[PDB]
Design a protein around this nucleic acid. Structure first.
Ligand SMILES: [Cl-]
Length: 52
DNA sequence: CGCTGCGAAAAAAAAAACGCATCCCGGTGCCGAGGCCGCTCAATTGGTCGTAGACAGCTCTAGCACCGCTTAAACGCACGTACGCGCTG
């Protein structure tokens, strides 16, 4: 019943959920692994901080 | 005479005066950030299905050594010429 947001499970502020959707609806591939969005929201957050 | 000293005279160069532009100080005032209000649709859960990819091997390619013959490049040096380089008007 209690739904923790994946972004929390990675300790990322970047939305690992919205990254997963954007990828599947991006037409990048047929199938997205479940680590991929994590890995990507991570890298995104990181470069966001590096500039900020 | 030469030396010299000075007295320009000539720039140097300095300094200093002028005036101009760039900074900064401190109080206006304006607008857009930043923070609340609800609310709606996109993320989560959990759970079913079916197939992408991990593995365990089987093949035969094609990539890595070795090896002298035969050249055509490389190395290299010497001589000389055309070019790059800098100053002035
Ligand atoms: Cl993954």
């Amino acid at each position: 019943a209690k739904a923790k947001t994946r972004s929390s499970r990675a300790g990322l502020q970047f939305p690992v959920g919205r990254v997963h959707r954007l990828l599947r609806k991006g037409n990048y591939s047929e199938r997205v692994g479940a680590g991929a969005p994590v890995y990507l929201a991570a890298v995104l957050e990181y470069l966001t901080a590096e500039i900020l």
